[PDB]
Design a protein around this ligand. Sequence first.
Ligand SMILES: [Au+]
Length: 129
Amino acid sequence: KVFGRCELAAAMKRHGLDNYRGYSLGNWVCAAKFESNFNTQATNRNTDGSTDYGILQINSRWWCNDGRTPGSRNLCNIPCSALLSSDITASVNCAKKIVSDGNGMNAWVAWRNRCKGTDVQAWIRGCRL
Ligand SMILES: [Au+]
């Protein structure tokens, strides 16, 4: 699924990401935009042979099993393909465990380079939330 901006903001809010570990809803929306373009099906290989999955580009190096990332962890206890669903539950719950692990949203390279220290409020402008 490719979400609309406000449609994704509403789903993320419903799922509790809103000010989760202090990150306002617009940070999450901005991260999704720059990670996946709001597309739940997005996949992208990393240089180390891991892959990033879904709307939040969750890495198989640590968080999920894709059957082709040797000596990696699966800390969300899920197949990475779960992260590609039209339903974002698995992605959001996994993201909660990622952001909570001590480095915050900096785990998301697109967030750190494109969203951090910007007016992320603009990502939820106009949305009925
Ligand atoms: Au403001």
